[PDB]
Amino acid sequence: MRALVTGAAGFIGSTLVDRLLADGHSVVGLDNFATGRATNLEHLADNSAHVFVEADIVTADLHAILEQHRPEVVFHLAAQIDVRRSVADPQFDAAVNVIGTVRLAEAARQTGVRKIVHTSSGGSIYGTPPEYPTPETAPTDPASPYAAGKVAGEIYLNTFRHLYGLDCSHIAPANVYGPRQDPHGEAGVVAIFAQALLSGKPTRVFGDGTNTRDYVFVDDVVDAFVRVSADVGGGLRFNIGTGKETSDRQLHSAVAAAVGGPDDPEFHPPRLGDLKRSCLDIGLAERVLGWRPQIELADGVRRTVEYFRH
Amino acid sequence: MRALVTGAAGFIGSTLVDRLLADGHSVVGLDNFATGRATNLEHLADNSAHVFVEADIVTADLHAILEQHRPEVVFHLAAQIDVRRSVADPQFDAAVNVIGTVRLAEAARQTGVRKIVHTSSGGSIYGTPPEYPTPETAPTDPASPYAAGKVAGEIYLNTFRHLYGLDCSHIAPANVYGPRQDPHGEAGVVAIFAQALLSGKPTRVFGDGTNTRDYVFVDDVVDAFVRVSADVGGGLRFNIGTGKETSDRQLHSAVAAAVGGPDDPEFHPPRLGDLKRSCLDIGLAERVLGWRPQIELADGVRRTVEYFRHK
Ligand SMILES: NC(=O)c1ccc[n+]([C@@H]2O[C@H](COP(=O)([O-])OP(=O)(O)OC[C@H]3O[C@@H](n4cnc5c(N)ncnc54)[C@H](O)[C@@H]3O)[C@@H](O)[C@H]2O)c1
Numbered sequence A: 001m002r003a004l005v006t007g008a009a010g011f012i013g014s015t016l017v018d019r020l021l022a023d024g025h026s027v028v029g030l031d032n033f034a035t036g037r038a039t040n041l042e043h044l045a046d047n048s049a050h051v052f053v054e055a056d057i058v059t060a061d062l063h064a065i066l067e068q069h070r071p072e073v074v075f076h077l078a079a080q081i082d083v084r085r086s087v088a089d090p091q092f093d094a095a096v097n098v099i100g101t102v103r104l105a106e107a108a109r110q111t112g113v114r115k116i117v118h119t120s121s122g123g124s125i126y127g128t129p130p131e132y133p134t135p136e137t138a139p140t141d142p143a144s145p146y147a148a149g150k151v152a153g154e155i156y157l158n159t160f161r162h163l164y165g166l167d168c169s170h171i172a173p174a175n176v177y178g179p180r181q182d183p184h185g186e187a188g189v190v191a192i193f194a195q196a197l198l199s200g201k202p203t204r205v206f207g208d209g210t211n212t213r214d215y216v217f218v219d220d221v222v223d224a225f226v227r228v229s230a231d232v233g234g235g236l237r238f239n240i241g242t243g244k245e246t247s248d249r250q251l252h253s254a255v256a257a258a259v260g261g262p263d264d265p266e267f268h269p270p271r272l273g274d275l276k277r278s279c280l281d282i283g284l285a286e287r288v289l290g291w292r293p294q295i296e297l298a299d300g301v302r303r304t305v306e307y308f309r310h
Numbered sequence B: 001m002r003a004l005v006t007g008a009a010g011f012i013g014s015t016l017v018d019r020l021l022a023d024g025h026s027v028v029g030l031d032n033f034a035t036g037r038a039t040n041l042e043h044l045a046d047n048s049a050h051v052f053v054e055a056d057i058v059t060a061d062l063h064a065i066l067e068q069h070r071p072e073v074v075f076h077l078a079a080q081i082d083v084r085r086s087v088a089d090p091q092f093d094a095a096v097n098v099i100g101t102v103r104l105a106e107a108a109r110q111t112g113v114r115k116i117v118h119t120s121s122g123g124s125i126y127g128t129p130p131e132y133p134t135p136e137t138a139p140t141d142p143a144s145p146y147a148a149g150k151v152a153g154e155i156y157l158n159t160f161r162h163l164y165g166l167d168c169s170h171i172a173p174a175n176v177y178g179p180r181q182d183p184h185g186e187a188g189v190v191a192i193f194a195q196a197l198l199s200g201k202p203t204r205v206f207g208d209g210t211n212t213r214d215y216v217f218v219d220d221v222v223d224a225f226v227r228v229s230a231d232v233g234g235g236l237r238f239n240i241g242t243g244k245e246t247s248d249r250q251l252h253s254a255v256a257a258a259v260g261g262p263d264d265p266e267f268h269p270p271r272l273g274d275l276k277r278s279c280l281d282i283g284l285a286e287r288v289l290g291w292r293p294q295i296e297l298a299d300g301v302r303r304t305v306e307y308f309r310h311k
């Protein structure tokens, strides 16, 4: 296929690019380096099947870009990804995550694109749900601007599906981790911990450390994107996770055991906008797509740490 | 109370300003006249309980405005209202209806506002539901960017409610008609029919003319806004309509009757983005707010046609 990946310079995006190239596709990567890194893509300098476009989804001529490259599938991973930043500046988050997605859809529907694979946020869109693990049938109830924008993005793509037959599916991952996740942010706890613990720098958990997330390895998530790119699951969201809860404190212990050295995080005040629990029911992805996660947390943590050691 | 009304120079907005003033409130109006009209507010020039601020919700310093005026309730009616325009320029529609709403919420949560009453679109957000009349429990399924953005605004306001305890309710009207609806507007079939049939100018219906809407009189809609502004229905949407369906063809006949002339529209092709049926279950509003619509279509059309004759 001819693929285009927005957010290609990012953690998941760069990993998806690699997988798509490995499967023999041609890939256009698109990014503005808001949070992405050139180092994530530098190994591709001499890869014959990849081309990079530096562009802001909010302001670039996406019509002209899509007209030139004519991708069959757009994997839409460009976004403002930090929940706390979305609280600090909800307008900016909405511009990137809602307006950006709208502009992309409007360009795609005019340029013969078959399908947009959206990245929603399985970990946050349900807010405090009726049950854990949470199925896609549960109502969305976002409690951060980030979560709200991801839902809105789903709704807009569904609308473009009705209007124009521009197909879409929503990949809704839980908490993604693994190599290339930026170690120097406030989001990406696994990378934050690994980097800090390897460097002997201080680490922290928030509140009482009991918050849970569902940690799913990047390679597994990438496989979900590939499967859903076909003519399957039009208009549908798929939760992509493990269906297992790990507390902040337990996560810290796992990373420290992998690094070696102390397991003694500081405790900081709770962060407004952060949910207490997150756990995804992944039955739908299993049946429809034949998707199952391969990498258990212990294995994933080892691989991640080992990646940061070098 | 101190109230602020966005979209105050518009059809429903200006009517709401009047009601709030009549009830003894102070009212700040806000508008950028994208679609609004100076004539809608001109009678208020000397009313000291009313202040008007010209402002674009997309770019204006809404924080500074709300800080100055300190409204207890914001009635948010400012929006891009035309479904066809939303299809033609989804980005612009999203900028006004989504970004605009987000900026207002962000400003309001910082400036002591108690509640934002949002205006959704009961008529469009449900798409093609299996239930008519459609209850609020029916999943949203927008088929136009306009409808999508309306849902998006609801969700964002629900989010600010979780985050900050900034209360919200979503008034979701069906098809609103009555005095002050722009006769030369691209939208607003009742006004469009009255303006044309009064001018003896051509009229038209889309498809085969069988598409239905739920026609609710502006005064009834305004009353719902008032009722929901209290500490009630937090994070809930309220369908505001009559729960009765009128086909495009039937409405033409009903306006034609009021005007008195011929009942003979042209039939033009369906418009991309338009739904085939719309009808709201108004039970929740009755149970929770005590709200019921007073004005039947015949009475409302007569009052409207009469307004147009007076000019
Ligand atoms: N990491 C997770 O746990 C997780 C789980 C659920 C959802 N997601 C979603 O997955 C996607 C990838 O996130 P990630 O973890 O790889 O983070 P990331 O920051 O590494 O990737 C996001 C990429 O989008 C780019 N981007 C941001 N704004 C842009 C704009 N205006 N124009 C162009 N590019 C822009 C960034 O520069 C970056 O390269 C995002 O949509 C995110 O919301 C992430």
Ligand SMILES: NC(=O)c1ccc[n+]([C@@H]2O[C@H](COP(=O)([O-])OP(=O)(O)OC[C@H]3O[C@@H](n4cnc5c(N)ncnc54)[C@H](O)[C@@H]3O)[C@@H](O)[C@H]2O)c1
Residues within 6 Å of the ligand: B006, B007, B008, B009, B010, B011, B012, B013, B030, B031, B032, B033, B034, B035, B036, B037, B055, B056, B057, B058, B076, B077, B078, B079, B080, B081, B096, B100, B119, B120, B121, B122, B123, B172, B173, B174, B175, B176, B177, B182
């Ligand atoms: N009329 C209906 O049948 C109906 C039904 C359901 C929903 N609504 C909603 O009711 C509200 C009022 O609509 P109306 O029928 O009075 O139409 P209208 O066009 O008369 O009123 C909308 C007003 O918003 C103003 N506005 C638009 N963009 C703005 C911006 N960026 N900044 C500031 N002001 C801006 C316009 O100038 C106008 O005065 C809207 O939110 C609309 O979507 C209308």
Ligand SMILES: O=c1ccn([C@@H]2O[C@H](COP(=O)(O)OP(=O)(O)O[C@H]3O[C@H](CO)[C@@H](O)[C@H](O)[C@H]3O)[C@@H](O)[C@H]2O)c(=O)[nH]1
Residues within 6 Å of the ligand: A081, A082, A083, A120, A121, A122, A123, A124, A173, A174, A175, A176, A186, A187, A188, A189, A190, A192, A193, A203, A204, A205, A206, A211, A212, A213, A248, A274, A278
């Ligand atoms: O130094 C740190 C950083 C984080 N955490 C905890 O780790 C968890 C995860 O936090 P973070 O890595 O910031 O991710 P989330 O805010 O949960 O969101 C991530 O996962 C979502 C899906 O659930 C995606 O949508 C988002 O883009 C992505 O940033 C939380 O419980 C935090 O309290 C710590 O204990 N210490």
Ligand SMILES: O=c1ccn([C@@H]2O[C@H](COP(=O)(O)OP(=O)(O)O[C@H]3O[C@H](CO)[C@H](O)[C@H](O)[C@H]3O)[C@@H](O)[C@H]2O)c(=O)[nH]1
Residues within 6 Å of the ligand: B081, B082, B083, B120, B121, B122, B123, B124, B174, B175, B186, B187, B188, B189, B190, B192, B203, B204, B205, B206, B211, B212, B213, B248, B249, B274
């Ligand atoms: O000349 C015309 C114009 C319209 N119609 C019909 O009248 C009905 C109503 O159309 P409008 O354009 O008046 O309104 P919409 O149903 O498109 O309503 C939309 O536009 C409104 C603005 O007036 C609100 O914003 C509302 O929320 C939004 O869904 C439709 O079935 C349409 O086919 C005609 O028969 N003849």
